[PDB]
From Swiss-Prot, chain A:
It comes from Human herpesvirus 1 (strain 17) (HHV-1). Keywords: DNA replication, Host nucleus, Metal-binding, Transferase, Zinc, Zinc-finger. Essential component of the helicase/primase complex. Unwinds the DNA at the replication forks and generates single-stranded DNA for both leading and lagging strand synthesis. The primase initiates primer synthesis and thereby produces large amount of short RNA primers on the lagging strand that the polymerase elongates using dNTPs. The keyword Hydrolase does not apply. This is DNA primase. Associates with the helicase and the primase-associated factor to form the helicase-primase factor. One of its GO terms (biological process) is bidirectional double-stranded viral DNA replication. It is found in: Host nucleus. GO terms for cellular component: host cell nucleus. Transmembrane segments: none annotated.
Curated annotation (Swiss-Prot), chain B:
Component of the helicase/primase complex. Unwinds the DNA at the replication forks and generates single-stranded DNA for both leading and lagging strand synthesis. The primase synthesizes short RNA primers on the lagging strand that the polymerase presumably elongates using dNTPs. The primase-associated factor has no known catalytic activity in the complex and may serve to facilitate the formation of the replisome by directly interacting with the origin-binding protein and the polymerase. This is DNA helicase/primase complex-associated protein. Keywords: DNA replication, Host nucleus. It is found in: Host nucleus. Coiled coil: none annotated. One of its GO terms (biological process) is bidirectional double-stranded viral DNA replication. Belongs to the herpesviridae HEPA family. Changing A419V: In strain: Nonneuroinvasive mutant HF10. Changing T217M: In strain: Nonneuroinvasive mutant HF10. Associates with the primase and the helicase to form the helicase-primase complex. Interacts with the origin-binding protein. Interacts with the polymerase catalytic subunit. It comes from Human herpesvirus 1 (strain 17) (HHV-1). InterPro entries: HSV_HEPA. GO terms for cellular component: host cell nucleus.
Amino acid sequence: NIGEYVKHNVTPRETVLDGDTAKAYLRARTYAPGALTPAPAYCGAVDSATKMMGRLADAEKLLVPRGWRLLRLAATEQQGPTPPAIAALIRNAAVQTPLPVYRISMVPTGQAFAALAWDDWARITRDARLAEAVVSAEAHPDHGALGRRLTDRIDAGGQMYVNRNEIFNGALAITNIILDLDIALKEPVPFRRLHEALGHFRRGALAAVQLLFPAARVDPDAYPCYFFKSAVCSCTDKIGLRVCMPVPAPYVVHGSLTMRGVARVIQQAVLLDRDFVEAIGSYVKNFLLIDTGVYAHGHSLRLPYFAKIGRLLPVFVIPPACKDVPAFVAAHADPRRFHFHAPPTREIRVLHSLG
Amino acid sequence: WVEESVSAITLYAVWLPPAREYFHALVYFVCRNARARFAEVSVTATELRDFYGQAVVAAARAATTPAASPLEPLENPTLWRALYACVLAALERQTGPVALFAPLRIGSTGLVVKVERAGPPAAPRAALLVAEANIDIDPMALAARVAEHPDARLAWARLAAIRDTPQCASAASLVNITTGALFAREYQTLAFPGAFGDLVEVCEVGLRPRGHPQRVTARVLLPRDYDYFVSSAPALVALFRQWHTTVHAAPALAPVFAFLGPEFEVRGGPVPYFAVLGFPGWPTFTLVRGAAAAYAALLGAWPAVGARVVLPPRAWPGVASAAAGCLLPAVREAVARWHPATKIIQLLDPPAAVGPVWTARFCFPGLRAQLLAALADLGGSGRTGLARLDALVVAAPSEPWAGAVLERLVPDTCNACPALRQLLGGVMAAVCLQIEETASSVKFAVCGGDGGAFWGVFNVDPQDADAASGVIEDARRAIETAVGAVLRANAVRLRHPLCLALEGVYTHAVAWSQAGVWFWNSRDNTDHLGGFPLRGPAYTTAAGVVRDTLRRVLGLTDALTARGLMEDACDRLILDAFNKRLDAEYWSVRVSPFEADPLPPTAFRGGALLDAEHYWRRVVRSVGVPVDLYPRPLVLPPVDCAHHLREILREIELVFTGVLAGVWGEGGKFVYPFDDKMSFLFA
C-alpha cells in the first residue's frame, strides 16, 4: 500500500508556529505579497550573465556594511523598515522582498538572470486565458468532457518573455508542490487517454498529499491540482507535464530534501494506483515520472506559459465535484499557483524534514 | 600667603639643569581667589624608576612635545604616567600639601615656594564642550597597524596614524564651548580661518628657575569663569594643537602638550577618560560631580597615572613584606601559601541545590579596598597616596564615585604587585576561616563564596515563622564582630568599622558552577541570578528566561516535568528570537581585546567611529561584523541567529543541567534539539 510506505520510509518533523510568529514566518520566507500580483510593467534586474556580475559588483559598493552569481542573487534578500538591499541592484526604492529570481536561456546560447519585484503577468498569460463567459457557456456536464473541451479551446528583457525558469531558493519556504513530469513513451498517446490518466494522477497524488499532511482537510474531490502539458497530442518520444498543487492549509514546507521527499512519495503513490498504470501503461517505457532532483538550491524549472530554447499550457483536469469552475480555470493563470515560494493563499506547521 | 584655591595642576616644562640625573620640572597652577602661579620641582633617577617600575634622558627628550608632534605619549605611555606621578610626588614633598578645589595658603622668582593647608572656596564652575572633527586618515595605513598588532583597538590605530602623519590634523574639518559667553568655530580646514579672549586669558609670567640660568618666560592660558570642561580623542587633540600652534607663535617658552587616555594603549583600557597633563592647563571630563570629586581627591592624576596614585610600583614589595611581617604567624603561613585556586572553606560542591531553608546572602562591602588601605599602613614602616586610598575608603560607602575608583584601583594596584595579591589572598583566607568558625556557633552554614561575599543556609530555622529575621540578625552581628575582632587581633586597623551587609533573604538556591548560583524566595517570588554571562542584549533576554524558568521549575515543590518546562522555555525563546532576526545590535556580543573574528577591511574606513573603540568590540556573525565601525542603519545579510542561539543555549544548558542534577539527582545532561527542531528558521 501507500500507508505502509509513508509509515516506514518517511519521518515527518513539523514545528507548529503560532500567533504573530506565523505571520512573520510567512512574510519572511515567501515572496512579497506583491511580487506575484500583476503590474503594468516590470521593475527588475535583467541582464546577461556578465552584465549581471557587473551590476552586482556595482551594488556591492553601495552595500558598505555587507561582507565583500546565482547564490548571490538568491542571497540578496532582507527588508528592515527602509528599502531592502536588493534595491541597490534593481534601482527602485519601493521594491519588496523576498522576490523571484529567474534563469533565462537565450538564443543562440548563453544564460541570463532576472530578479524582479513585479512583472506583467497578463502579457505572459493573455494568449491562454479563456473568457469567463466562454467557460460558463461550456453545456458540458461530465468533468472529463468539460476539461477536455476547455483544453481544446485555449534582449534579456524581451527573452524573459519566452523562456523563464524559476530558481529554487532554499532560504525560502515552499507553498506549492511543483512536480516535473517527464513521461517517456514508446508508442504515441491520444489525448483523452492522457486526460483520464491525469485524472488518476490527481487522485493518487492527493491521497499521498493527505498522508503527508495529516491535519489538513484535503478533500480528494475539490482539491486543486493544476496540470500544464508542453505543446491531437502529436507528441512522440517524450511528453512533458507540470503538476502544481497547493500545500494544504496549515502547512508550509521547508527544505530541498523535504520537497524531494514529498515528490518521491507522490511518485510511489501514483505508481501504486492500479488505474493510473493501466490507463497510461503500454505507452510508457520507463516509469520514473518525477525528477525529484530539481528541488535543489540553485536549480531551475521552466515555468508555465514559457517555451524552451513547448509552451506549458494548461490541461484543465477539472476536480470531481468541483464548485466554482470559472475560478479553477482562472487559477491556471495566477503566478502564485505555480511558483515554489509564493505567498500562501492562526498557526502554521512547517514540515522541515522527512528524512 | 595668598588665600586661594588651586583648580588644576599641569606640567609645563621638563628640562635638565646646566650641569647633570636630577631633571627638573615646572608646573602650572590655576589658582583662584575667594590667577596663574607656578612651582618648580626636582626629580631624581631613582624616583622616576620607582614610579615606572627608565632613564632621564628619555624623559627629557619628552621635550619634543613642545611642538606640533602631537601624540608623544603613544610612543611610551607608562613613561608619562611615571613622569606625571613623580612630579605630583615631588611637588607635595617640596611645596607641601596640595589639594585641588580646597582652601589653601600659597607662598610665592615667582615660583610658589610653599603651599601649607588653610574660607568658603569659590564653587568650581563648569564649561560644556561639544567638538567634532573629520580627520582624513588613509584606511590602508590604519590597517598596517593592526597588521602589526592583531588585537589593536582602532582608536589606537587611529591615533598612531595621526602620529605618523601629523599633517592629518592640519587639514581637518572641526567646537562649541558654552561657558555661561559662547565659543563656536567653523573650520573647513583647521589650519585656515565668539572670542578666544572671553573664554581664556593669555597670561605671561616671568620666572627665574634655580636649574635655569635665565629669566624664563612662561605663557599660559588662564580659564575665566570656568574651571573644567565636560564633554573624540583625535578631535580634541587637533583642537588643542591648533590653540598651541597659535598661542605659542612668537618668542617665549613652549609647554608640553601631552595627553593620556585608554585610546593611547594598543590593547585599550576599560574606562574612558581624557587626561590633560600639558598645554591647555585644565581638565576635560569626558554624574559629573563624580568625575569632579575624583579629580579633586586624587589630585587629577586618576586614572591618568594608574595605580601610582597610592604608592609607586617598586615600593610595593617593601610594603608587602613589611605588612606580612606584622601579621600573626598563623595568618602569615596563610599569606605565604596562598595560591589562587585553593579550597579554604568547605562549600557546597556543585552541582548542588538547597531546598526549603532560610537561605541568606551576606557581603562585607568594599572589604578588598579596606584591607589594602589597612595593610598599606601596617607595611608603612611618602604616605600621601596611602592617605588618598584611605580617603576613598571612608567615602566609598556613601559616595558612589569613590567606589568605581577603588573597584578599579585595588585590582590595578596588584595588576602590578605580584605579591600584594598574596597579602590580599592570605589575609582573605583568614577572614574566611573565621566566618566559618563563627558560623559553627550562630546557626549558619556557609555554602559558598569568597569571604567578602558569601551565602549560606540557616540550618536551624524552622523553615517558617517570623523568628528568622532575629536569627539572621544575630548571625550578621556575630560575624561582623568576629571578623572585626580577628582583623584587630592581627594589627590590621580599618578606616571605618565593618558593616556586614544583608543582600537578601532567600529560601531556595541552586549552584551549578563555581560562580553560578541562582536564588529564589518562595514567600515572595523574588530571586537573584549570578554567573550567567551578559555579553549582549540577547543574553539579558536569555537570563530573564532562565530566571522565569527556574521559578516555575522550583515551583514544582518530577524531573521529566522539569525537562518539559525547560524545553518549553527554550522553544518560546527561539521563537521570540526569530521575531528579532534582523536586529543586528541585539545579537552583537562584546569581545575583549584578550579573547580572540577578524576585521573586515571595509571597517577600516569607518571614519570618526573607530575613535570610540577603546575597549569593547561589538560583533555579530558566517562572517563577523563589527557593528560599530559602520554608519547607521546597517545593510546586512541575515544575522547568523543559529550561531548566537547556539552559544546562548550552551550557557542555558549549563544552568539547566546544574539544576536538574542538583535538585532531582538526574545524571542526564540537559540537551536542546536545535539542529533538529528550530534550526530551519534560520536557514
